[PDB]
Amino acid sequence: STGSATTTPIDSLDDAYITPVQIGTPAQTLNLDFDTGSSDLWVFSSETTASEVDGQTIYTPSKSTTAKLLSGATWSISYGDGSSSSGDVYTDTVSVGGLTVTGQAVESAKKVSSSFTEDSTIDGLLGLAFSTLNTVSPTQQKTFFDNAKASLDSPVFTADLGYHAPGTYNFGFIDTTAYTGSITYTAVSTKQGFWEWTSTGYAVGSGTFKSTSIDGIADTGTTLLYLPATVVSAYWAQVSGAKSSSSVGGYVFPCSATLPSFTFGVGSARIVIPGDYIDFGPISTGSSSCFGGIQSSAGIGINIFGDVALKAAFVVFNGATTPTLGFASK
Numbered sequence: 001s002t003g004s005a006t007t008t009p010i011d012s013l014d015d016a017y018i019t020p021v022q023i024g025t026p027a028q029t030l031n032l033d034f035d036t037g038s039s040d041l042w043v044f045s046s047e048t049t050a051s052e053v054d055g056q057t058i059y060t061p062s063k064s065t066t067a068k069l070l071s072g073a074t075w076s077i078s079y080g081d082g083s084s085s086s087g088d089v090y091t092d093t094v095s096v097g098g099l100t101v102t103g104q105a106v107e108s109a110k111k112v113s114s115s116f117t118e119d120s121t122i123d124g125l126l127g128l129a130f131s132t133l134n135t136v137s138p139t140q141q142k143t144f145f146d147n148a149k150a151s152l153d154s155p156v157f158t159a160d161l162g163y164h165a166p167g168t169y170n171f172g173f174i175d176t177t178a179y180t181g182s183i184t185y186t187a188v189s190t191k192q193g194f195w196e197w198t199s200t201g202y203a204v205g206s207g208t209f210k211s212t213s214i215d216g217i218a219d220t221g222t223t224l225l226y227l228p229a230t231v232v233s234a235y236w237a238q239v240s241g242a243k244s245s246s247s248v249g250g251y252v253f254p255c256s257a258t259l260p261s262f263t264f265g266v267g268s269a270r271i272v273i274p275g276d277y278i279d280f281g282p283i284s285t286g287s288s289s290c291f292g293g294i295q296s297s298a299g300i301g302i303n304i305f306g307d308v309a310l311k312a313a314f315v316v317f318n319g320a321t322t323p324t325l326g327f328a329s330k
């Protein structure tokens with residue numbers, strides 16, 4: 001089997017991407033944030049505290065003839081931005097882009113934190129990291145991908161995120177028309193439950209490439225590119241007036257600037273992020289200070305190749321017995 005679904009930016013800055021997902025019978029379609037940095041599929045629901053729902057589409061398990069309470073199971077998750085959610089669990093039929101999994105754990109939110117409530121466009125998350133991070137207790141549950149894997153033509157999914165445009169998540173096949181050149185594959189460590197890999201270095205603009213190992217994670221659920229302070233300082237040093245602002249919470253730059261590109265290494269290959277991808281707009285409405293899309297990972301504890309980096313590539317998440325990651329230009 002295979003699946004193919006379009007993913008669409010939620011706003012003009014590509015802060016996140018939503019992908020429609022069919023849950024239950026008859027189908028209830030919710031727009032989920034596909035997240036290769038976590039492993040829970042959770043949704044706003046009829047059980048979510050009413051004051052914590054503001055415009056989201058909800059899953060109502062009582063209206064699904066295939067929903068079943070997973071007795072005794074609860075879940076609770078906290079994300080890197082300090083956001084959180086928790087609730088109970090149903091099993092139900094879940095389909096993405098024509099690919100159907102029966103008996104998928106659908107984690108129904110009873111509570112969500114304010115940042116979730118405030119984002120009316122995101123109806124929940126669909127985790128695509130390794131199932132070892134799944135938070136369901138007392139019986140850990142499998143991700144949609146892990147459940148689908150055996151049925152897929154090939155045990156892979158791909159992320160093809162657009163810049164200010166829709167893109168695609170494919171399951172079970174590699175669309176050879178979706179990228180240019182060849183895909184370069186690189187080793188993955190699953191020891192922390194993430195799609196963790198080692199970049200071979202970087203360049204800033206037209207500068208020379210610096211060969212240096214940068215361990216990090218391929219994370220579709222993180223907006224920005226978080227890298228060591230040395231790397232990030234070398235980038236922003238090439239932008240007149242750029243500075244790190246503790247009050248704003250990162251590097252900012254004059255909105256009048258034209259940003260340089262940033263290149264990262266994948267083996268002997270190179271992925272170029274155009275400068276425009278690194279512009280996240282005014283820090284507040286009408287401001288002439290703009291927020292940078294490359295930020296320091298110091299204090300996070302891990303480097304994160306988030307959407308800013310991933311949307312510059314066609315990315316293969318290869319879930320074979322020994323997982324690997326593939327990157328191509330596009």
Ligand SMILES: N=C(N)NOCC[C@H](N)C(=O)O
Nearest residue numbers: 035037079081083219221222
């Ligand atoms: N960051 C990852 N990978 N997952 O979830 C992201 C949702 C969270 N509120 C955030 O904005 O970070």
